[PDB]
Design a protein around this nucleic acid. Structure first.
Ligand code: MG
Ligand code: MG
Length: 729
RNA sequence: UCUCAGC
């Protein structure tokens, strides 16, 4: 069965609304014009003189026609005149089909977008945000707009409506002031700017400052008008500065003026900042109890507005008034095997403290390592090392005095030279300490520590050695990371799938550097899933993932003198629409690449697609308060189709947990669905940078970290000597 | 890098 057993049935409730699945009499039609005018809007206008024969309730998408009632004649031929052409254009009617299951959705999304437009909602980006009731945050010139993201699809329980509250931050002030910050260019490159006088939301494409707002443009049959005059005529406002660089948008020569503009979306500066996130996230990160009512009061609003009320009764569909109520299951909390003893996770599924009191399973001993630092931070670094020697013996590690090396100063060449005169085979780890964060020196250093000289490093920033409180915990968080960078596993969980490799793939979208789309590739190399062989992929990915799979298979063979019987490939980084693309292109490549070795080697494969950015929300509930559900809750019925499941593994403190969507796009493994769901739950714990369950499984997040490291700082492939270790953490 | 129509 699709529904696995072995959990605990907890009453959950997702944010899906079951549309009334009785939408018949929706006969699709077709129109044929022996004058083939190549404009859908012109065709619609041409047939508009015959709208009385149908009614307002029609959908003419250029070629077809959707009507909630029998068309007047499925072979009727009328003559239509054109105010421009003047020809007696043919009018055609077709009894193509009453759509069964394919174009029903494409109709419902169109009419539902029309409905949401009737509620005075605007289309910004892809979803819909309100404008009457912003949530004022007048502390940063920010201003939030409530909004909703909706979709309708053929989920197993019929036709369901997705609905999840969104939020779109918009700048209270103007844009020219934002253009003051040029010298203290390539940033307004897709920034969704909107105006205020009408709240019409443009999307910007190209900026050429070679123009002035006083220029005139040929509009409305040779009537040149200047922007200063056009805007004062059409909106009765003035312009203070007459030299601002205009903004250009073109529908898929609209020259905007950046005094009436106002950006949406915090733009890399509020993004790279600790200040504004704590200010915004109090509102953006909505707790589940508020979100449930922000959902229900949307339905109370939707069943009161006149256009919204009438449109449903026109097409006949009855939108229900309360979210779904399913019966999810809660997988048992999983034991965490340490070296000597083991602790079960709490309901919170976090062992951040119990990992600081037990022994790691395999500790690599730091007999000889080094530290780099500056005069300004010599004392703090020395104390950090002195008490790092004090915290390792508790946790089962064993460290000794490092070759305490002082760089000359903070210039990057000094660090480069100091590393180059220091690297030797008789070495374990070089632990570097920087005064201030800067990607130039960081990248120039990590290239040397990850390409030229394969020495696993560890960068620390000076502010983190507070030497007041965040030193014991920082040392206990860096010792455990340094242990893993040396190929020593910390904790493990009983995974009863004997002799099965597990692979994890994720990609990193870059738009500037060639769009190479670095993709990581991480696979286990031991039957306990604690040591990961991590390679990388490069292409301008088709051919390199087969090479990485073959190399990882060889590596697993070397360690275990065997070959895996199963290969679970938790593919991630799929686009929102290519969820079937992998099921046809790369799965055949993975089956083909097995041919290099093996006596006709037959791995029982399973390619699982992992999706994070979804819009489902599983609210667990006991009573009448839809709270967050405890991590480890599986839902796979009446919400998913084609054998895929939703899993709540993350845990948050503020907000609603987003369950993660795993699609099983290839299943030859003979694994019962129960076992694969449980396994996908176990791999959640195995991330050695956060003791406790995380969003995606261990290999997927490992691969994401590796891909981000390669893309943002390395821009090459790491040395193949480092691969058997988790040099990336 | 202690870490999760409009112009
Ligand atoms: Mg993804
Ligand atoms: Mg790290």
């Amino acid at each position: 069965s699709q529904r696995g057993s072995s959990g605990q049935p907890v009453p959950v409730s997702a944010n899906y609304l079951p549309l009334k699945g009785n939408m018949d009499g929706v006969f699709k039609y077709a129109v044929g014009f022996n004058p083939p005018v190549e404009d859908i809007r012109s065709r619609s206008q041409l047939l508009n003189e015959h709208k009385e024969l149908i009614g307002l309730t029609r959908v003419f998408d250029g070629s077809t026609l959707y009507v909630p009632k029998r068309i007047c004649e499925q072979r009727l031929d009328l003559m239509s005149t054109r105010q421009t052409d003047g020809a007696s254009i043919k009018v055609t009617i077709s009894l193509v089909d009453s759509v069964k299951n394919r174009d029903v959705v494409q109709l419902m999304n169109v009419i539902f977008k029309r409905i949401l437009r009737s509620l005075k909602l605007q289309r910004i980006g892809r979803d819909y945000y309100d404008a009457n009731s912003p949530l004022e945050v007048p502390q940063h010139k920010m201003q939030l707009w409530p909004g909703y993201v909706t979709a309708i699809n053929r989920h197993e329980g019929g036709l369901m409506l997705v609905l999840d509250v969104s939020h779109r931050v918009m700048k209270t002030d103007t844009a020219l002031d934002f253009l003051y910050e040029l010298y203290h260019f390539k940033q307004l490159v897709g920034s969704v700017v909107l105006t205020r006088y009408n709240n019409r939301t443009y999307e910007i494409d190209d900026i050429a400052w070679d123009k002035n707002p006083r220029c005139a443009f040929q509009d409305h049959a040779g009537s040149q008008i200047t922007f200063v005059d056009y805007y004062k005529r059409a909106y009765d406002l003035d312009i203070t500065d007459l030299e601002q660089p205009l903004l250009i948008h073109r529908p898929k020569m609209v020259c905007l003026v950046p005094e009436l503009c106002a950006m949406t979306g915090l733009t890399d500066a509020a993004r790279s900042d600790f200040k504004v996130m704590k200010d915004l996230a109090v509102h953006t990160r909505v707790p589940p109890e508020k979100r449930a009512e922000s959902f229900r009061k949307f339905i109370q609003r939707l069943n009161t507005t006149k256009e919204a009320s009438e449109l449903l009764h026109s097409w006949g569909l009855v939108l229900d008034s309360r979210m779904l109520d399913m019966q999810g299951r809660r997988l048992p909390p999983e034991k965490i095997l340490f070296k000597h003893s083991s602790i079960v996770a709490n309901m919170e599924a976090d062992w951040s403290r119990e990992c600081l009191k037990e022994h790691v399973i395999s500790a690599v001993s730091l007999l000889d390592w080094a530290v780099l630092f500056v005069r300004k931070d010599q004392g703090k670094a020395t104390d950090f090392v002195n008490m790092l020697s004090k915290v390792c013996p508790p946790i089962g590690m064993e460290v000794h005095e490092p070759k305490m090396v002082e760089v000359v100063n903070d210039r990057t060449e000094s660090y480069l030279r100091a590393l180059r005169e220091l690297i030797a085979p008789r070495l374990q780890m070089v632990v570097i300490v920087f005064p201030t964060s800067r990607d130039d020196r960081y990248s120039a250093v990590k290239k040397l520590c990850c390409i030229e000289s394969p020495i696993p490093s560890q960068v620390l920033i000076a502010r983190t050695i507070t030497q007041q409180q965040k030193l014991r915990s920082v040392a206990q968080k860096v010792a455990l990371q340094m242990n893993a960078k040396l190929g020593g596993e910390l904790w493990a969980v009983e995974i009863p799938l004997k002799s099965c490799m597990v692979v994890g793939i994720d990609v990193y979208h870059d738009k500037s550097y060639g769009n190479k789309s670095i993709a990581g590739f991480v696979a286990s190399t031991n039957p306990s899933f604690t040591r990961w062989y991590s390679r990388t992929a490069m292409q301008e990915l088709i051919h390199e993932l087969k090479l990485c799979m073959q190399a990882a298979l060889k590596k697993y063979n070397e360690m275990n003198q065997s070959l895996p019987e199963r290969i679970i490939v938790f593919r991630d980084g799929v686009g929102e629409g290519r969820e079937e693309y992998v099921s046809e292109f790369e799965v055949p490549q993975f089956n083909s690449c097995f041919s290099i070795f093996g006596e006709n080697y037959c791995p029982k494969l399973a390619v699982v697609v992992v999706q994070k950015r979804i819009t489902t929300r599983i609210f667990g509930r006991s009573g009448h308060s839809y709270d967050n559900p405890p991590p480890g809750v599986i839902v796979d019925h009446t919400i998913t189709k084609s054998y895929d499941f939703y899993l709540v593994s993350q845990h948050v403190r503020q907000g609603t947990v987003s369950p993660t969507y795993y699609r099983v796009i290839y299943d030859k493994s003979g694994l019962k669905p129960d076992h694969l769901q449980r396994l996908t739950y176990k791999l959640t714990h195995m991330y050695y940078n956060w003791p406790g369950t995380i969003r995606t499984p261990a290999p997927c997040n490992y691969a994401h970290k590796l891909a981000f490291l390669v893309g943002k700082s390395l821009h090459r492939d790491p040395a193949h000597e480092l691969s058997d270790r988790l040099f990336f953490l």
